[PDB]
């Protein structure tokens, strides 16, 4: 079929940060191979000069929301892995 690229599950945000974020995200994975460093690069990239500290996780699935609520988060699939980023104080 006519694929696309890095899919996105949950984001709940503005294309501004969502696109920009997912941008550095996909790109990150499209630049780095060490996912750990990828997610660390995304959070670090943002947290840098945005609103630290950010907390990202790289597992397989993330179902909480009504548990460890945060401020800004986005869970999608980067390349061929999962990535759930979220800013929690």
Curated annotation (Swiss-Prot):
Answer yes or no on keyword RNA-binding. no
Write down the CDD domains for this protein, in alphabetical order.
DLC-like_DYNLL1_DYNLL2
Keyword Transferase assigned: no
Please name the GO terms that the record assigns under molecular function.
disordered domain specific binding; dynein intermediate chain binding; dynein light intermediate chain binding; protein homodimerization activity; transcription corepressor activity
Q: What is its main location?
A: cytoplasm
Per the UniProt entry, what are the Gene Ontology biological process annotations, in alphabetical order? actin filament bundle assembly; chaeta development; chaeta morphogenesis; establishment of mitotic spindle orientation; imaginal disc-derived wing morphogenesis; microtubule anchoring at centrosome; oogenesis; positive regulation of neuron remodeling
GO CC terms on record?
centriole; cytoplasm; cytoplasmic dynein complex; cytosol; dynein complex; microtubule; nucleus; protein-containing complex
Taxonomically, the superkingdom here is: Eukaryota
> InterPro entries this protein is in?
DLC_sf, Dynein_light_1/2_CS, Dynein_light_chain_typ-1/2
The family database entries (PANTHER family) matched by this protein are listed as: DYNEIN LIGHT CHAIN (PTHR11886:SF35)
Family in the record:
Belongs to the dynein light chain family.
Q: What is this protein called?
A: Dynein light chain 1, cytoplasmic
* Recorded name of the encoding gene: ctp
